[PDB]
Structures are given as structure tokens and as C-alpha cells.
């Protein structure tokens, strides 16, 4: 929860200095940590209490309600396209980070 809130501050305070990469990486990282939280609450509220035996609730219900509020209907594949065009032609090296299946070209070569 602190990491999610902190990552909100990085993107929020990255408006100036035209950083681009720091805002872009934190935005991707924000989705990644949110992705981890989604199955974190799914493996605590769901799965019952099998591995542990006691219902741990690391994140409040209010916190779950809000994070979905902003994160509803978010697609990471268009995040790079959603970036400004100046960033697009300037940080094209990071074009594959937006893809959810970015761990495909590397694995294909290994395979």
C-alpha cells in the first residue's frame, strides 16, 4: 500500500523537468505492483486460509476500493502509445516494456 501510494507521488511529481522515462517507468511499475496486489488480496481473501490458517488483511477494504477506482479499464499495451510523441521517438528503446508479454522475445531466443 505504501509502495502504491509512493509510486502515485512519483508520477504525480514528474509533471515537470520533462523526465519521461522516470514517469513512464514508474507508471509501468505502478501497474506491476498493482498487479501483484490483485492476486495478493486474491490469495488472502480467496484460497481461504490454507497455507497460513488465519485471515490476514494487509490492505484495508477502503484501500482495495480506491486502487480499483483509478485502475479500472487500464490496458498496458497502449501505455507507450499513450506517451507523448517526443518521448516515443526519444525513448523508443523502452517500447517493449509496455507490452505485458515482454518476456517473450528473450525467452524465444533462449528457447
Amino acid at each position: 500500500e505504501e509502495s502504491y501510494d509512493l509510486y502515485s507521488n512519483i508520477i504525480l511529481n514528474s509533471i515537470d523537468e520533462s523526465n519521461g522515462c522516470v514517469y513512464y517507468l514508474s507508471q509501468i511499475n505502478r501497474y506491476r505492483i498493482y498487479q501483484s496486489i490483485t492476486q495478493a488480496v486474491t490469495q488472502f481473501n480467496g484460497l481461504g486460509l490454507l497455507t497460513f490458517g488465519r485471515h490476514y488483511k494487509p490492505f484495508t477494504d477502503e484501500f482495495l476500493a480506491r486502487i480499483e477506482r483509478e485502475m479500472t479499464n487500464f490496458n498496458i499495451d497502449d501505455l507507450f502509445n499513450g506517451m507523448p510523441f517526443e518521448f516515443q521517438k526519444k525513448y523508443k528503446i523502452l517500447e517493449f516494456l509496455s507490452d505485458n508479454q515482454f518476456l517473450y522475445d528473450d525467452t524465444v531466443k533462449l528457447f
Binding site: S8, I11, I15, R69, E70, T72, L79, G82, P84, F85
Partner: protein
């Protein structure tokens, strides 16, 4: 739930997935973020001009006349000082601001004078090209546009970057030709949803006049979200239907108090967000056609992989 309102929901949700949806958000949402209303701004202007605000309530003419007097009487210097005192402030984004961007809009047009909605773009992630003057139109960093009718003091600490005085409305077409030219161009090609208005604003009426004046029937009918606490009247509803505004009232869908605007705003918008095409399917009549509509183009292909069939069914 009502048949008349749900058919509107199907059009917007389908257009949102198509990427041809544009949200016309008004100043009503700003009150949710507890932002200084324009009503209080004109009350301050009247207080300085007359030494004391009028005891009687200010009618529609009072909203547009009083700022003009203050500009002419107290001058431009006092005009900007009160605006900076009253409007230059930081407020958190209301839940509507982010969920406005939940349906990815190709362009966003707002009548707000503030930066409440630009922070929503960056916080969400989509970078909308904020436009407030002719220079901003000339430089199009991104295809997706965020239209500011007035804009902040980013154009220099001047008074022309706002449209509040009465004369500004009269010469709005000529003072801001490009942003008004792009204003109507978006509407002709994109679905427009009006959220955060009292169904009596000048801007919505003036736009409605242009489409009613000479537009034939090519343009699509924009949607309106009446969030007023009182229920809409049938006679009022019928008139706007002929004008070309499919009003989606909020009090009709959910009955609440006269103060919990955020409850009314969120419930209808979440109803828009959470309702999908399969949500509105009720019986076998809506089953076969819905399934056939998405699979029919694939009939040309001899064989289709079974694994990736989830793509056409939105997973």
C-alpha cells in the same frame, strides 16, 4: 434499468472500446473536489463593487453581467487579483475525474478553468495534449487532445486567458477561432457525453443552438447526464430530445438526497462503466444475435484457432 437510458449506455460503451468516445465534462464535477464554485466568485465581485453583496439571490443574468462591470470599473488589475485569490489553489481529484478517464477518451473537452483534469491524465497514464490557446493547437504533441475553453495563466499572467466577462462570450468565436474550430470538429466525428451541467448553462445551450441551427441530421446526438437532485420533468425531457440531447438523468436511476452529489455522480457513471453488452442480455433473444455479431465476420475464414477465440469475446 429503464429501457430509454440503457440503450444510450450501449452506444457509449461500444464507442469507448472503439476509441471514438469524447467526454464533455463540465464544472459540476469540480464541486465534488470541493472547489470554489463560480457562483461564489461572482458573489465576491458584487461584494467589492457594491461594498456588500446583494441579499437577493442572483439570477442567470447576474452571473454574466457582474464580472463585466468589475472589469470595466475596477480595471484589469483588480480582476486578476481576485481570480488568483479565489481560483489559484490545489485540490484533490474527485472520483469522477479518474473514472472519466476510465473509458479511454480519444479527446476530452472540459469547461473547467483549473488543472484538476490534467492531473487525472498523468495520474491515469494517458498523456492528453492540453490545449488552451491557438499556440497549443499549432503544437500537437499527441493525437489525443484535452480542450480548455479558457486555460490557466500558462499563457502569461494576463487576463485574456479566461472567458468570464460578458464581452468575451460575444467575441469567443473570433478571440479563440482554432479551439472553437476543433471544438465542433470533435463533435462531428466523436460521441459527446455532457457531464457536470445544470441543463441551463450558456455553453451547452450555445452548442445546442449551432447543431439545431444548420446541421441536417448527419451529426450524432450527444448524451447529457442530468445530476440535479430533483427528478427531470417529462415536458422538459421531450424538448431536449427534439433538440438532439439524449438526457440521462441521475435522480431517475437512483433516488438520493439533495446534497450527496458525489453519490449521484458516481452511481450513474459506475453504471456506465460496469454495464457491458453481455450485462444487458436477458433471454435467448439477446443471446444468439450477440454471439453471432462477433463470430459472423470469422465465417469467411475456413478455420480459426480455438485458443485465441477469447479475443473476440473480450476475454
Amino acid at each position: 434499468l429503464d429501457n430509454n437510458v440503457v440503450e444510450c449506455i450501449k452506444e457509449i460503451t461500444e464507442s469507448s472500446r472503439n476509441g471514438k468516445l469524447v467526454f464533455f465534462v463540465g464544472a459540476g464535477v469540480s464541486t465534488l473536489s470541493d472547489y470554489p464554485q463560480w457562483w461564489r466568485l461572482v458573489d465576491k465581485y458584487h461584494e467589492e463593487l457594491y461594498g456588500s453583496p446583494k441579499k437577493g439571490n442572483y439570477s442567470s443574468d447576474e452571473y454574466l453581467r457582474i464580472p463585466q462591470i468589475f472589469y470595466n470599473v475596477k480595471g484589469e488589475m483588480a480582476f486578476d487579483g481576485i481570480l488568483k485569490d479565489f481560483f489559484q489553489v490545489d485540490k484533490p481529484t474527485n472520483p469522477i475525474h479518474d473514472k472519466i478517464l476510465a473509458m479511454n477518451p480519444a479527446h476530452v473537452i472540459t469547461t473547467n478553468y483549473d488543472n484538476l483534469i490534467d492531473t487525472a491524465c498523468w495520474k491515469r497514464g494517458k498523456y492528453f495534449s492540453v490545449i488552451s490557446a491557438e499556440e497549443d493547437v499549432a503544437n500537437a504533441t499527441s493525437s489525443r487532445y484535452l480542450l480548455k475553453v479558457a486555460g490557466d495563466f500558462r499563457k502569461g499572467f494576463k487576463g485574456e486567458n479566461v472567458v468570464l466577462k460578458e464581452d468575451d462570450y460575444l467575441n469567443y468565436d473570433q478571440n479563440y477561432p482554432l479551439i472553437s474550430n476543433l471544438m465542433k470538429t470533435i463533435i462531428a466525428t466523436h460521441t459527446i457525453v455532457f457531464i457536470g451541467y445544470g441543463l441551463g448553462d450558456y455553453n451547452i445551450n450555445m452548442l445546442l443552438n449551432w447543431v439545431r441551427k444548420l446541421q441536417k441530421d448527419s451529426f450524432h446526438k450527444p448524451f447529457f447526464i442530468r445530476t440535479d437532485p430533483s427528478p427531470i420533468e417529462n415536458e422538459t425531457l421531450i424538448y431536449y430530445e427534439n433538440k438532439g440531447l439524449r438526457i440521462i438523468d441521475a435522480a431517475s436511476l437512483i433516488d438520493s438526497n439533495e446534497y450527496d452529489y458525489l453519490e449521484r455522480y458516481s452511481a450513474v457513471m459506475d453504471l456506465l462503466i460496469e454495464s457491458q453488452e453481455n450485462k444487458f442480455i436477458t433471454k435467448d433473444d439477446e443471446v444468439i444475435d450477440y454471439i453471432y455479431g462477433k463470430i459472423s465476420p470469422l465465417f469467411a475464414l475456413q478455420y480459426i484457432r480455438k485458443i485465441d477465440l477469447k479475443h473476440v469475446f473480450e476475454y
